């Protein structure tokens, strides 16, 4: 009952983090709702505040501690670091303000929640502490700690309780105020009193040449100055900083401000100390994605009003340009590491036309370019278009190769939905010739690639560098002479290494490097060579890379005897899909072994063998378990109750890899009981249940199937939809 | 879920060599198609085996996939399976250590696990003593899981048919058959066999076997060739379909690993020049599935399939039918692309799209047929050709009839015979399509048998369809047997309407016999009007010992009927031939050899020589006594037609006589018989008189049968000339048909049945 109640809870506990729901106002309710939902007797028990404050924080640090103590039975490669930044996250900065406003400032409750803990969890993380590794060697508890002083909800006495008795603290460094303080151009910290204003008056005076150029942290901008020391923030105003944006940037959307719009893209497609992952902690990603989406889906009908006969146009262009250019990389980096679809978003919100949108089946196709240039895709059964496509690639190829000069007219007449197919085409058929030995003239492309890097033509490269590998791994098995290399190397380093760049340029041209480096790195060691990886190493150690091997970045000289793996999951014949899996079928059946509460290496592992094979291999194998063995917890088979429990620790697992949300549940109910649905739950197990229910239905009207077989399967079946109905979600 | 796609093989020669899955004691099966009565039909009873890796000196584990080496030109006889660990077991039936034997035994090859050569004929369950072996489970899915198994061919060539058309210059349907040059990849004579098998982890394997050695030799690789084996493990690929392409010695390995989602495209090389085999890999492209459709519908890649296509369509790059089903609806859509080079001034071009108004749950290609059967939910099948994807039930409706060539029929399916109500998949453990399309096998849950299902036609009462069916089901065979198929299935088929147009009217069902089986002639090219030289080449034909085997069964329900006793007496009749001019060249040979050999007299070889010499004469003595049983029944049937030539019950006489080669093969039998008595009379056995014994007794027979045989053979003779002069009196093709099959003389021919 109690082992039930805290698996349920840490379960519950990891789904709810994954599916950045922390800032829904309903955490408090579910959480104490819990208890009521697990038991199926009634159970009308007055919890008091300070026992839900309690019962989270021994939750949250025993999750943790699981957390970090199933890491070593992992793969030392099968790096997946998301979700122990979001725990980090998590546990600084929402708890202490669950107990600001959810606690009565009671410093007894929290000397008995951090003193009850077991110091199994101290030994693990010393110990892992060390190995990695007396230096500083700080525990989640000290931050914990640190931020409810800075909120006046313990006096600076209570640090020194729990500190080590040896080592105090002194109370006056310790920072005890919640107001923003930033280091001036003079060295005075100064208090940023208003946070929009700042934000506002430091972006407007925004340089953008000031992103990767300013290494050092004495830079004159106090904005920069934040993101370079973003681990420092107070506990309570970060919330306001990151609602800050919103209400900007969705301001920005209805004036069309093209200016701050596209500054702001840049500072967070870089995620300089893990500023990027806070924000999906706070907002929603899902509303994030609604206003970024509606922007590049309304700037159609923006271009039939703006007639380009000023002098300020050309402004207002490369202002317009860069501002859709930069809002596309948005999406592809939340998309490729932050797990986010582009597709779901579309289908929740019925406002967005799927078939009209352009974003969509662009990002599906991003790393492929289709060999035909079309320009419009809806219309190919007509004819007048394509008699001027061909008149748009041989005008914009005499243009840059032979005139060395882009017309005003090209410009104006072109879309930048074009030029973010038309770039791509012209330098897959100018390398591809040069490869073959068609283009024998180096010098003249080197100033050709040149033009590529002007601000008007910054949106051509997003597909450029997304191709080079599936170019690149042909090349890497096929027999290319080192005259030739050297020379696609020249061209390559043109783009990669540009001589000068512009003050709008800079910035855009390193992140878009950021963007696909990983796998290209792999490629390019497998081989002028030496300044392609020493930039793309350069452009990686500008920011942290999630899910990287760190010895990979910075292989130059270190040789560990081990061989590098470059992907989230990684297998080995020592330790095949087969052990890892019979490590799962006895923790399927009896928990054992180390690898569950661990979704990222869970997850992944079900795709790999698809919910199909996963739920075959184990739902059938479990008999064979069942019928010699018996089950663990009871030294006596009597009785099918005991069984039952063991049967509902794993339907209540695939229950959460199913339902992510909250009204979401009350729509998968009517589905079994009988088109919106499926659609987002593709590859469900509601769905493969569901659709085998009624098929064999079917043949019991022609009755092809035994009786007793037909009531087997709907036996698993109404126990799915008798847990999803008694359980809120 | 996927249905067992490679659980089931239908072997060239018939048998049908299955997965078992629930014997206790038994993990594969054997049958085939047998005869009850000579109107029914019935699986034989099931030969089950036991297959452990242990066989070379204990647990069992399950059979993943079966696969007859039935492609192209392959003899068919060598099955190799697959069990769920991963290790190839190769059996080899119809041959033993010592002699050789039937198709139901089984014999081993060599055990892999490390491979190792150990000859061992294997034996039923049921007759062995009850063993300690037990059903284990292999239910992880290993690195060295195979997931696709395919066989290498010879460099023999093939020769097959496309298409017929009808001429309506003629009124007839003629059809053209283009001979198909081997494509792909293929293993040289001096190796006895190849074969090549993906595991699921991506490492490859291929077996051989030199022609001229019994040691066997594997070579290994593995597709991911990086330099970290961190990545070697990795590739857990979901489809791994291997499409041979014109290419030389090159196999498309088309790939979907879903920890990169995308569908990957490999080239696979082969140097077969006794140097070992050299293998070589070149990761060619890689491409991402499309999320959505046109109106806005998302899309789910259930299964990809890729055909296996020759040169011989216009355009030879493979079809790659990824597959998608819109979520809610009943709708299925069959995205086809096409793998091209990329050209200067690859790639894979999109053609169209396909939508179907039902889900798929099973996708089988068919062999040497080129076409792709959807198993759809309701159990009906929409097979769809891979030249224009035009249904084939539905191509004689939508079909263009005007132009030169009308009515294009390539299997009796385009006729309108559709499957009936078949049992749904999910009580079904496996489906497959018969060869020939005629019919479907299922396999049920709770039916310790195999169950079939044939094609039914709804306007069997429409008389005016008669002639069209006939012609669909001629050029039905015209196939098989250029594939070398048994097409026992295709037979049933034709049965069971012919049985139904009997049930009303007996006379319209004999009229179906006739036109039928004579557009197998026009079909192959031989024509029974032809002069006599061609008559010769006809006799030693095979197809005889089946066109006529297929009246043997369409006409067994017709008692009293000698349709069937016509095509018998001249089956026989060949049996007869194989007996006497079978050993006539045989003894022949041994004239030579006595003379020879007449140097060395006490040599221990030539008395067991001298012994049989005379030992083989003595077997034809049983032969002759049915020789001479036969023509005593007809002369018997001569007297009795005399007093009542009304009598229709007896006119099996007529046909005998009327067949033109059988007076000619008579006659040659009795040349034969009056050289082998004067070679016996001319050299004599003299060294034993003991052994003269069964040369005497072949004289006495001959002089004792109660008809002189010189009578005998002007009887036959006089009949062909008259029959001869006949034909230029007034010219016809159909007596040639009448004198042979029909064994009747038409009315029009009333005073040509008085002579006889």
Redesign the interface.
């Given at each position: 009952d109690m082992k039930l109640l805290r698996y349920y809870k840490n379960i519950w506990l990891n789904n709810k983090i994954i599916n950045w729901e922390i800032s829904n106002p309903d955490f408090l309710s579910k959480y104490s709702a819990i208890t009521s939902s697990i038991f199926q007797e009634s159970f009308n028990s007055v919890q008091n505040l300070d026992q839900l404050l309690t019962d989270l924080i021994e939750t949250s640090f025993t999750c943790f501690a699981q957390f970090v103590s199933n890491k070593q039975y992992h793969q030392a490669?099968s790096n997946l670091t998301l979700l122990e930044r979001k725990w980090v996250i998590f546990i600084t900065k929402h708890l202490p303000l669950l107990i600001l406003e959810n606690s009565s400032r009671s410093p007894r409750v929290v000397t008995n929640a951090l003193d009850n803990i077991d110091e199994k969890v101290v030994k693990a993380i010393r110990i892992y502490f060390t190995e990695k590794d007396p230096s500083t060697s700080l525990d989640i508890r000290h931050d914990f700690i640190k931020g409810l002083i800075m909120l006046n909800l313990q006096p600076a006495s209570v640090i020194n309780n729990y500190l080590r008795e040896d080592q105090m603290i002194d109370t006056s460094i310790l920072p005890t105020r919640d107001d923003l303080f930033v280091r001036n151009l003079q060295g005075i910290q100064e208090v940023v009193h208003n946070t929009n204003s700042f934000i506002i008056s430091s972006l407007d005076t925004l340089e953008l040449e000031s992103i990767t150029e300013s290494i050092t942290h004495d830079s004159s901008n106090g904005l920069f100055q934040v993101l370079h020391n973003f681990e420092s923030v107070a506990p309570t105003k970060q919330r306001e900083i990151v609602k800050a944006f919103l209400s900007i940037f969705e301001d920005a959307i209805k004036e069309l401000n093209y200016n701050r719009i596209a500054k702001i893209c840049a500072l967070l497609f870089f995620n300089f100390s893990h500023s990027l992952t806070t924000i999906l902690s706070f907002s929603s990603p899902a509303a994030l994605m609604k206003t970024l989406i509606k922007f590049v889906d309304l700037s159609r009908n923006g271009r039939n009003g703006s007639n380009g006969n000023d002098e300020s146009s050309e402004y207002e262009t490369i202002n317009i340009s860069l501002s859709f250019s930069w809002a596309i990389l948005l999406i592809i980096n939340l998309t490729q590491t932050y797990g986010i679809s582009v597709?779901d978003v579309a289908?929740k919100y019925p406002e967005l036309?799927?078939?009209n949108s352009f974003i969509?089946?662009f990002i599906?196709?991003?790393?492929?370019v289709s060999?035909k240039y079309y320009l419009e895709e809806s219309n190919v059964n007509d004819s007048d278009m394509l008699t001027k496509s061909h008149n748009t690639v041989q005008s914009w190829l005499c243009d840059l190769f032979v005139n060395g000069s882009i017309t005003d007219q090209l410009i104006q007449n072109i879309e930048t939905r074009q030029l973010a197919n038309l770039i791509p085409f012209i330098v897959k058929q100018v390398l591809?010739?040069v490869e073959?030995g068609?283009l024998t003239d180096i010098s003249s492309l080197i100033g050709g690639f040149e033009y590529f890097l002007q601000p008007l033509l910054l949106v051509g490269l997003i597909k450029t560098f997304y191709w080079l590998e599936?170019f690149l791994?042909?090349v890497k098995?096929?027999t290319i002479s080192e005259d030739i290399l050297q020379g696609i190397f020249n061209l390559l380093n043109t783009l990669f290494n540009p001589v000068t760049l512009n003050e709008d340029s800079k910035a855009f041209h390193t992140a878009v490097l950021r963007l696909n480096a990983i796998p290209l790195l792999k490629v390019l060691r497998?081989f002028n060579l030496e300044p392609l990886i020493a930039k793309l190493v350069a452009v990686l150690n500008v920011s942290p890379v999630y899910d990287v091997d760190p010895r990979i970045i910075n292989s130059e000289n270190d040789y560990s005897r081990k061989?590098?793996?470059?992907?989230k999951?990684?297998?080995?014949?020592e330790n095949?899909?087969?052990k890892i899996?019979?490590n799962q079928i006895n923790s399927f059946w009896s928990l054992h072994s180390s690898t569950y509460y661990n979704l990222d290496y869970l997850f992944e592992l079900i795709?790999?063998?698809?919910p199909?094979?996963f739920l075959?291999?184990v739902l059938?194998?479990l008999e064979?378990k069942l019928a010699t063995y018996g089950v663990p917890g009871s030294e006596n088979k009597r009785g099918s109750l005991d069984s039952e429990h063991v049967f509902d620790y794993f339907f209540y697992f695939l229950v959460l890899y199913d339902v992510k949300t909250a009204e979401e549940a009350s729509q998968l109910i009517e589905y079994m009981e009988n088109?919106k649905?499926?659609?987002l739950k593709?590859?469900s197990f509601a769905?493969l249940l569901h659709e085998?229910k009624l098929?064999?239905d079917?043949?019991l009207e022609?009755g092809?199937?035994?009786k007793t077989?037909n009531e087997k399967f709907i036996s698993y079946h109404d126990k799915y939809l008798c847990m999803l109905k008694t359980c809120v979600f | 879920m996927m249905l067992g796609e490679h659980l089931m093989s239908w072997s060239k020669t018939g048998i049908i060599a299955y997965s078992d899955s629930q014997s206790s004691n038994a993990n594969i099966c054997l049958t085939f198609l047998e005869s009850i009565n000579g109107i029914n039909w019935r699986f034989h009873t099931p030969q089950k085996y036991v297959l452990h890796p242990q066989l070379h000196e204990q647990f069992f584990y399950n059979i993943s996939s079966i696969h007859w080496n039935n492609w192209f030109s392959l003899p068919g006889d060598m099955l190799a399976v697959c069990d769920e660990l991963g290790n190839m077991t190769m059996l080899i039936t119809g041959q033993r250590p010592d002699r050789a034997t039937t198709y139901e035994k089984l014999t081993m090859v060599f055990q892999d696990n490390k491979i190792y050569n150990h000859v061992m004929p294997l034996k039923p369950v049921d007759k062995l003593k009850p063993m300690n072996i037990e059903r284990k489970q292999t239910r992880k899915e290993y690195n060295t899981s195979i997931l696709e198994f395919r066989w290498l061919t010879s460099s023999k060539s093939v020769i097959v048919s496309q298409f017929c058309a009808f001429d309506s210059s003629s009124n007839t349907y003629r059809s053209r058959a283009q001979q198909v040059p081997p494509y792909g990849v293929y293993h040289p004579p001096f190796i006895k066999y190849a074969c090549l098998a993906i595991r699921k982890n991506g490492q490859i394997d291929f077996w051989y076997q030199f022609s001229n050695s019994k040691d066997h030799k594997k070579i290994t690789l593995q597709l991911l060739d990086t330099s970290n084996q961190r990545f070697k493990d990795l590739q857990w690929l979901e489809f791994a379909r291997i499409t041979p392409m014109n290419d030389d010695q090159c196999m498309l390995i088309t790939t979907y690993s879903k920890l990169s989602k995308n569908i990957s495209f490999y080239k696979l090389h082969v140097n077969w020049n006794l140097n070992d085999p050299s293998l070589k890999i070149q990761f060619i492209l890689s491409t991402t599935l499309d999320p959505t459709d046109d109106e806005g519908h998302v899309l789910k890649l259930e299964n990809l399939h890729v055909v296996s296509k020759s040169s011989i369509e216009k355009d030879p790059s493979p079809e790659i039918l990824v597959l998608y089903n819109v979520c809610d609806t009943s709708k299925s859509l069959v995205k086809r692309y096409r793998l091209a080079p990329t050209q200067l001034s690859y790639n894979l071009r999109r053609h169209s799209d396909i939508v179907l108004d039902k889900k798929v749950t099973l996708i089988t290609s068919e062999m040497f047929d080129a076409f792709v059967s959807f198993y759809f939910e309701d159990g009906t099948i929409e097979s769809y050709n891979q030249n224009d994807w035009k249904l084939e039930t539905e191509r004689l409706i939508s079909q263009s009839q005007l132009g030169k060539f009308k009515n294009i029929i390539a299997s009796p399916l385009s006729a309108g015979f559709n499957y009936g109500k078949l049992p749904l998949p999910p009580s079904v453990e496996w489906m497959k399509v018969s060869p020939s399309m005629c019919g479907v096998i299922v396999k049920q849950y709770n039916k310790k048998w195999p169950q079939f299902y044939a094609a039914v036609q709804k306007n069997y009462a429409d008389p005016e369809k008669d002639s069209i069916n006939a012609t669909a089901l001629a050029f039905g065979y015209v196939k098989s047997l250029h594939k070398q198929i048994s097409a026992e299935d295709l037979t049933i088929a034709a049965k069971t309407h012919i049985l139904r147009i009997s049930f009303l009217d007996r006379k319209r069902a004999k009229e179906f016999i006739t036109t039928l089986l004579k557009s197998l002639y026009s079909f192959f090219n031989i024509s029974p009007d032809a002069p006599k030289e061609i008559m010769d080449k006809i006799i030693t034909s095979r197809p005889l010992q089946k066109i006529m085997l297929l009246q043997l069964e369409l006409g067994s329900c017709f008692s009293q009927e000698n349709i069937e006793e016509m095509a018998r007496v001249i089956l026989y009749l060949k049996n007869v031939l194989f007996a006497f001019n079978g050993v006539a060249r045989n003894f022949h040979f041994a004239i030579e050899q006595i003379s020879n050999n007449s140097n060395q007299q006490q040599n221990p070889k030539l008395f067991q020589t001298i012994f049989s010499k005379q030992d083989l004469i003595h077997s034809l003595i049983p032969v002759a006594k049915w020789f001479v049983k036969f023509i005593t029944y007809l002369t018997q049937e001569i007297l009795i037609l005399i007093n009542d030539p009304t009598n229709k019950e007896y006119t099996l006489v007529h046909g005998i006589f009327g067949a033109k080669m059988s007076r000619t093969l008579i006659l040659s039998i009795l040349n034969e018989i009056k050289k082998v008595t004067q070679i016996v009379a001319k050299f004599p056995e003299t060294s034993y008189p003991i052994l003269n014994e069964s040369s005497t007794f072949l004289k006495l027979v001959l002089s004792e049968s109660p008809v002189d045989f010189e009578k005998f053979e002007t009887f036959l003779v006089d009949v062909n000339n008259k029959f001869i002069a006949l034909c230029e009196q007034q010219p016809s093709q159909e007596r040639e048909f009448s004198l042979l099959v029909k064994a009747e003389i038409p009315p029009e021919y009333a005073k040509v049945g008085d002579f006889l």
């Open positions: 490669n597709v289908l036309s799927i078939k969509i089946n599906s196709n991003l790393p492929n060999d591809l010739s073959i068609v599936q791994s042909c098995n096929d497998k061989q590098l793996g470059y992907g999951f990684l297998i080995l014949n095949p899909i087969n899996m019979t795709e790999l063998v698809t199909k094979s075959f291999d059938k194998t064979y088109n649905i499926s659609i593709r590859h769905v085998r098929l064999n079917l043949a022609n092809e199937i035994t077989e | -």
